[PDB]
Write a protein that binds this ligand. Sequence first.
Ligand code: 04C
Ligand code: 04C
Ligand code: 04C
Ligand code: 04C
Lengths: 201, 216, 202, 202, 204, 220, 196, 196, 213
Amino acid sequence: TTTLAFKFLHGVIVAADSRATAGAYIASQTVKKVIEINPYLLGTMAGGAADCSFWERLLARQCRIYELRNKERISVAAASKLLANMVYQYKGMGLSMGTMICGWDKRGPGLYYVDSEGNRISGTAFSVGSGSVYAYGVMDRGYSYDLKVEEAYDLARRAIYQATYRDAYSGGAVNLYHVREDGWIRVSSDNVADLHDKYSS
Amino acid sequence: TQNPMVTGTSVLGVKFDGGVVIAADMLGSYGSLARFRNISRIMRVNDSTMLGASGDYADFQYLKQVLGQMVIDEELLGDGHSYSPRAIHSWLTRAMYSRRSKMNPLWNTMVIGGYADGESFLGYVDMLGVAYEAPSLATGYGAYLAQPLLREVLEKQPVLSQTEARELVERCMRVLYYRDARSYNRFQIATVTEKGVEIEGPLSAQTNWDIAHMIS
Amino acid sequence: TTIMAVQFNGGVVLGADSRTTTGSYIANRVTDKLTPIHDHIFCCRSGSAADTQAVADAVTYQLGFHSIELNEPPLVHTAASLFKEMCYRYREDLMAGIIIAGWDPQEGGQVYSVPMGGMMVRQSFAIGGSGSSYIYGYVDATYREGMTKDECLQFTANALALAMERDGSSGGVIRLAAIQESGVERQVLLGDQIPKFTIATL
Amino acid sequence: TTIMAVQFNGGVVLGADSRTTTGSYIANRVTDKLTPIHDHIFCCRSGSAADTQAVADAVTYQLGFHSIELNEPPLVHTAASLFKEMCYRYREDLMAGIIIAGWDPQEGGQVYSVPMGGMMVRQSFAIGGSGSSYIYGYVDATYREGMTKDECLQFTANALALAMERDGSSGGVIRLAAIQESGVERQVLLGDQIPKFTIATL
Amino acid sequence: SIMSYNGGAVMAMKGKNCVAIAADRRFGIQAQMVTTDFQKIFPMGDRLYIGLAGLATDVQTVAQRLKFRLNLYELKEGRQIKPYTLMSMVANLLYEKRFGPYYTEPVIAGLDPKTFKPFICSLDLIGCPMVTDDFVVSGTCSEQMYGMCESLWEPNMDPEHLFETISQAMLNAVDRDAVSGMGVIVHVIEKDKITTRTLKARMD
Amino acid sequence: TTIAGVVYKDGIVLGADTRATEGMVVADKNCSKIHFISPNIYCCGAGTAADTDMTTQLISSNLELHSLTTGRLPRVVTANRMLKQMLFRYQGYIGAALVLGGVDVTGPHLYSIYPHGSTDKLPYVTMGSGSLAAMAVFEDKFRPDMEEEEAKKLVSEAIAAGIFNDLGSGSNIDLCVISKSKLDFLRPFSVPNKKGTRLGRYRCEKGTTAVLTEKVTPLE
Amino acid sequence: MEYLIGIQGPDYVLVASDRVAASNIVQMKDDHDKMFKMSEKILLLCVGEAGDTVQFAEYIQKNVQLYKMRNGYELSPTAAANFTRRNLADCLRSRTPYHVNLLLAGYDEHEGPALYYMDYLAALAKAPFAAHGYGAFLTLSILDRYYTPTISRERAVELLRKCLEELQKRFILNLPTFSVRVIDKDGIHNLENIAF
Amino acid sequence: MEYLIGIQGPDYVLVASDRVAASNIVQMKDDHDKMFKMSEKILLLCVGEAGDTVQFAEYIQKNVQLYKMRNGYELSPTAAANFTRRNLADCLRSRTPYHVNLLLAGYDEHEGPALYYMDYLAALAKAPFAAHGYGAFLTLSILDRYYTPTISRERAVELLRKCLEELQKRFILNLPTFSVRVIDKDGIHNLENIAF
Amino acid sequence: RFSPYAFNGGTVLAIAGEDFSIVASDTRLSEGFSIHTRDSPKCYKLTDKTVIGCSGFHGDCLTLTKIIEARLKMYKHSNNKAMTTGAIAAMLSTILYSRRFFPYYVYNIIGGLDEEGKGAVYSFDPVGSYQRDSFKAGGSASAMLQPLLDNQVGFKNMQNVEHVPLTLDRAMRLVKDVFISAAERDVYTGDALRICIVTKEGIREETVPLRKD
Ligand SMILES: *[C@@](C)(CO)[C@](*)(O)[C@H](Cc1ccccc1)NC(=O)[C@H](Cc1ccc(OC)cc1)NC(=O)[C@H](C)NC(=O)CN1CCOCC1
Ligand SMILES: *[C@@](C)(CO)[C@](*)(O)[C@H](Cc1ccccc1)NC(=O)[C@H](Cc1ccc(OC)cc1)NC(=O)[C@H](C)NC(=O)CN1CCOCC1
Ligand SMILES: *[C@@](C)(CO)[C@](*)(O)[C@H](Cc1ccccc1)NC(=O)[C@H](Cc1ccc(OC)cc1)NC(=O)[C@H](C)NC(=O)CN1CCOCC1
Ligand SMILES: *[C@@](C)(CO)[C@](*)(O)[C@H](Cc1ccccc1)NC(=O)[C@H](Cc1ccc(OC)cc1)NC(=O)[C@H](C)NC(=O)CN1CCOCC1
């Protein structure tokens, strides 16, 4: 995998690839790695394929029950804390998942990194996955808090593309999400092969 | 069972026109030692189905006891329902897999033979819960020696008479005695038929040793 | 160990050596490996000293209560079945090679083998223990159908003496027990009494 | 394997089973384990097929040259010494259990044991191989001081027959060879010819 | 796996009176890509090529040690090497290191001098020759390449049809392997000419 | 592999399958496993494929060097000794399971030689992953001093048994018939297995691939 | 942990390496040089094992110098890289394998600027840009992003500076100073050491 | 890798910790706060294994707060440290042991300033100054050299600065910023984050 | 100690069309170097609209199938309706993840019709990770079947071919051809090919022989 998320003036950009591997073998190139928990809350997937899918779907169940009981949307902090506690009980057992929880809160834009190791940290920008080291480079060089909406899109789109270029376990297509105050929107699903054409010109 | 002790080698089975025939030698080997030269490794389950077991004999004695009771429990009710050969096969797959999943396997490989409602049944069961049906079956070294011969004949002639199937087994048991070092030239022949289940006493395969003189 | 039991007409003959080893040291050079379980039922113990002993003591307790409750002289098969259940259920924890031999008014003299796996089989004669390896050939060559009680005593004593001769983890003294309807009679062979098969080389 | 050699006044008798295994499968069910080194010297091979085969080939080469260089019929002891020198030197590399039995016009019938260690000892009779474990008791009880050639033939044939019955690594065909001043006579025991010992339980 | 360390894939295909040889262009260490233009197919005598797949060092060490021996051969003999002769030379070179081999499974494709007959073969890391009339493959996506070639390859193919087959067989196989790709180079060897083409491929 | 050998009335009939494996995949569908030793001696091979090829060549080379010096037809025992002692020297690190067959001035001889260097002189032998399946045929149908065509039938059926019952073996059956009078190397003796005829049309039409770089080099 | 980087332009080769020599948790040296002068126009940047680095790079260095004295002229960058690779490849299966990841940069009379990447397994590859060390993982993507073959030397330094600043932001190891050198037709040029 | 430091004065406790959250080779966070507020006068400086740090620290945190609500008054620095030690020492031989090295800093109304040192094995030890992590090896000697029991807080921050500058000089890991806090009679005071 | 797993080979394939769904598998069951049976089709029907194919450890495949069938009735009893293909696929994911730390050594492929009558295919890993795709291979020969399908059905890597909709005839020929190709190289694949076809009216079965070696 490569996944990334950064917050700025206009919201939170969420980006991911679509490759899934079983050893050296590419299992899929059309994996949706960004899961839609709520109309305003998102979660990225990196690591064990089933682990990320199961536990983040468990979270989606957890968040909905919370909404029904309390008549109010769950916070980004509370949604990240639940997953951090659920996955901590299985520490050292073999679970492998690195996720980002993005949403718009009562506190504003929210971004948390949650590990199967038991990490839970808030931050402005994260990159998670095997090709994360490559995405970190290009993201940090072209990053500004004052970035225009479309300029932040191309930054995230390029950062995943650059990762798929160096990482063997990253590829397929770059998917983009934009978290606004009134909820997230689905930006674009661009194939890496098509991006290679554009960025070469 | 983590470590098998007294074990039985190959068990054979082939279905014919009329029923099923199963063969197994009467040896319980303790490693390379042939300790128990006179033990029955074939059991009659009910009127329509029988069982031959490879591997750990103590584990076989357990399954013999459990199945033994199950058949008794059915015949108590007298409701006109009895376990079909396919049912016993199904049950045994469930039992063996259950123990495998508990990481405490019954160290066995079974061959189930039966005759019910016109068609004859032959089924295989691993110590892991691998089960399937086949016109001919062979466990242990039988798989490498007997089964090839059993398949070759069924290629030319799919349906066999009781006599043809019986003398084929004679030929298979002869090869096994030549080549398997854990076998014994004293076996039982078990047969399922419309009449029921018959197990026959001590049988020996006639051997040839002419190839001794032609070395030089 | 070496242990042995032979079935004759009116009962059984049991025989064992007397050596207990802790590595290469004989901890007990005169051991009674023939354990009484009931009036006419005995068992021969080989393998782990603590393991076989504990099983024996549990079967004695179990058969004791069973006999009183059933109001019959206990079946040898029943005593063998109590050994089987324990040796099979705890086969991964125990190291026990048992031979159960005895008499009952229903089936007469009986010899049952319970090896390390926990299987049970009736035999005309049975042998067990580490020393039994060296006497398979002799025992198969010597055994005859329908031996008298006095011949079975000689047969067990000969087989054991040969086994104690070769096996390091066997030796000491031959202990014999004869069980029939009339009861149990015991004898012990010392030094000269052990059948001498002279050292056979140049 | 089971291998065997017996000594009498005129010379020696040699016996071997015919089974060779690759694990549990029998590669050759009718092997000739008795390997001629010279006119009157044979060796019985047990253990690794390839190891014992190479040693035998090299000894035959060495003794062959030795006998021509001395212009004298080769001593059995000399042949056995050439086995000792190799088996001892390469003890960590070879899996060899050799019995060297023969006749020479100076000492007569001779049976030498060279076991896995590489030591050498002369014996009245010797047994070797995995199957030999099961016949020590029988061999200790049957052997008599001063057996004739015909008696030695039956003695070795019986012991092997008993070994092949119990040992999985043994079986097939009994191979016998008698060596004296006259020369070497070899015979083969097939199926029914093998001394019948009835399987007796209940 | 030692063979999976650098990845790579080499393929050869037989045509009418021609042979094609293709390889991926990635040079990477495990997950990281390093170079997008790595050479795996080497010329051995105008109308004869060798493609080496495996560990990147051994690919290069064998290629250079083979040329060392081939140049001495072509000078000693008054002739240029024959396809079968090269195959036996490579097998010889690889078997010399029987108990510590070069981790490379070579593929030879070329046309026989004078007789202009097509020739393809693949070898072991210890040099076992395997001649075929259809195709030979070697690399990390061995299975992927086999599936393509079996379903695509046809008996008699003209240079253009042969090129389309090897190209499509390489591209689609490589796209299911993580450690292979980043471009595919193809050599079509005819009696009168050699066509060398780099294909449009995915770069992920 | 499956390889087999038999001794008949006139000489020796050797058999082999044509499958070579890389891991659990078929590397060569048509492989030559019956090897030339001398004009009168041939040798089947199983185990490590490269070890089979090179061992059999080296001995074939040594025997030719031997026969040229003696000026007479080489013996099967010489081939056996050369193979046995070499394999033993390498302690089984050269994985060569071999069936050696030929006709001498002494007559017809058949051997099985193991990677460790142990030899068996027998009327019928099997080596390889499908050897037990092949042996089951030999133990069922073999009779002493068979006719040429009867022995050809027996060995081909033994190899077939290996082919169909062992995953390590497949494809064609190769035979080699050696007598005092004649040598017959029947490469494709039997083709029991065949690829199914293609139904779909997957012709990659000209210009279906996109090209970035093209260079054409002219030749002589 | 050590770091190497190389950027090739139309007529120059820009190379840089950290000046940190560390032992377990301490920085023992502040001004360490990981660059070895082979010729007047060739540099060998050597990184890896504690003992192997100095021993290997120096052995090749004196051999190239021996070649200079032997024949009167210097080795080409291509010939130098192949000589280094041969000595590394030969030792790979021997009793003393050198665990060195190196980078060779040079300017040729007729061929121009050249940069070679080399594995510790001795896999030689020519690249427009290359990097070694854990720091390579963070920087290589920035090189892929802002590189053209027609990059001028002053903008190549800016590109290099973008890479070194990323090592201050994301890389967990302290790397304050970097040795910077350029090779062209005039030889090897010392540049201002980039410090933080 | 993480670093903690505490310096006790006559009427105050000065504590500092790095603001770096690291994943193998990358810095993920620039401003990671490693201090946990227990009471108005107690800080828990927690460091160690991935998930254990936050899980264990917050459990004590919420239990100390539970004690506040349940009784009205707060736990003393001594009472808090022993409570924390009991929870760690009881988990030591349990199914789930917490791998955390921590510093407890507090001010008492009677006994004044107190600094507690605690092993991951749960060994409690009161000290004038203490440190955790690899940085402790390079800083404890400086603390031994310039510390007096009657150190003024302005001169204590000066002593803290000396230690942090040593980490910039000798320590191999990049730790640019540090959290700095003081605890006295008036409570917990936030100081300017020392940056390099 | 003791291995609770065995590799039994076998490959499953599924292709989704507009009004159909094809689930195909070879019929060989293997172990080590020998064949257990030549008659072991891996594709199995669950409802009128859904077919499953299991490969890997047969012990688990048998058990898992028996679990699914039970659960199908459990759903039927409680909700008074047949389980939809998507609901079966979603349930299987939870059944497979329940054994996360003692995995089913199993590769599942579900094929059938969705709620609008269109072809649907679902691919699974041993621990329950799943997605909907147009075509998938799973098993010992999945690496051989996939690249050809990606080329022919997915039209990938070809320059100018207008994406012609899949026909039942062309998909059936494609299925037969890839398995014939697989039988040539993979040792675990052969004997016979079983094909299940799911349409508006029930499920159909077709059988083509393969190499027996
Ligand atoms: C990139 C591609 C790096 O692998 C991503 O991390 C990717 C994330 C993803 C993919 C699909 C759906 C959601 C998110 N990860 C993978 O594709 C992953 C690689 C991996 C294998 C095993 C792992 O366990 C330690 C961790 C990561 N691939 C898979 O999970 C594949 C589909 N399934 C298996 O390998 C099955 N395993 C699960 C664990 O137990 C052994 C069998
Ligand atoms: C012969 C002598 C050896 O095989 C008999 O089997 C004999 C049985 C016997 C002994 C006393 C009373 C009745 C019957 N066996 C022993 O003497 C026995 C040898 C043995 C040791 C350990 C075993 O593994 C569980 C199995 C057999 N010796 C003992 O039991 C002695 C008294 N105890 C020890 O050796 C202590 N051991 C226990 C196991 O762990 C190592 C230390
Ligand atoms: C009986 C059968 C077994 O104990 C005999 O000792 C017999 C001796 C014999 C055989 C042929 C000709 C003359 C005499 N031994 C064997 O049949 C022998 C058993 C054995 C195998 C390996 C050993 O350690 C090296 C020791 C004994 N069988 C063989 O040598 C066979 C032909 N080869 C193999 O088993 C191959 N092995 C080599 C070792 O590693 C495992 C595979
Ligand atoms: C049948 C096919 C076994 O399945 C035969 O024994 C056959 C023998 C043969 C085939 C062609 C030409 C001459 C003789 N053996 C093989 O095909 C053999 C299988 C095998 C693989 C690895 C082994 O471990 C040492 C032993 C046997 N296949 C090969 O030799 C293949 C082509 N090469 C490799 O797998 C690479 N090996 C070489 C040995 O060292 C490990 C890597």
